[PDB]
Design a protein around this ligand. Structure first.
Ligand SMILES: CN[C@@H](C)C(=O)N[C@H](C(=O)N1C[C@H]2CCCN2C[C@H]1C(=O)N[C@@H]1CCCc2ccccc21)C1CCCCC1
Ligand SMILES: [Zn+2]
Length: 92
């Protein structure tokens, strides 16, 4: 999938068709946080920073996971703010 083709929410949403129903995080929450489905298991990537996340757990918040593992993402920073990211990185 072309990263440029995934710049808008609606485009990201349509990538989730065969997304496993057993995974306790929903496409809407993933797509909102910049993620699209790469078509394997529960693997997703961010359209902006190309960071990959998998093995979603109950209670996971995709924005928090985005900040935990890919804190330099500019989409993340513009949406949630550097302060949010700093705190998730343990900078208070
Ligand atoms: C519990 N919440 C989940 C979202 C989580 O934290 N997942 C971790 C993760 O996705 N990570 C871990 C971090 C550590 C440093 C960078 N990693 C990014 C990410 C990951 O494992 N990404 C893989 C490897 C790189 C290629 C790729 C491509 C698509 C999707 C995932 C990944 C990890 C996945 C394997 C089981 C343990 C938890
Ligand atoms: Zn990102």
């Amino acid at each position: 999938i072309s990263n440029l083709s995934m710049q808008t929410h609606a485009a990201r949403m349509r990538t989730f068709m065969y997304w496993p129903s057993s995974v306790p995080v929903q496409p809407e929450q993933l797509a909102s946080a910049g993620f699209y489905y790469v078509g394997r298991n529960d693997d997703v990537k961010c359209f902006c920073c190309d960071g990959g996340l998998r093995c979603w757990e109950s209670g996971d918040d995709p924005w928090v996971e985005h900040a935990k593992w890919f804190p330099r993402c500019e989409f993340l920073i513009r949406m949630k703010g550097q302060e949010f990211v700093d705190e998730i990185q343990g900078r208070y």
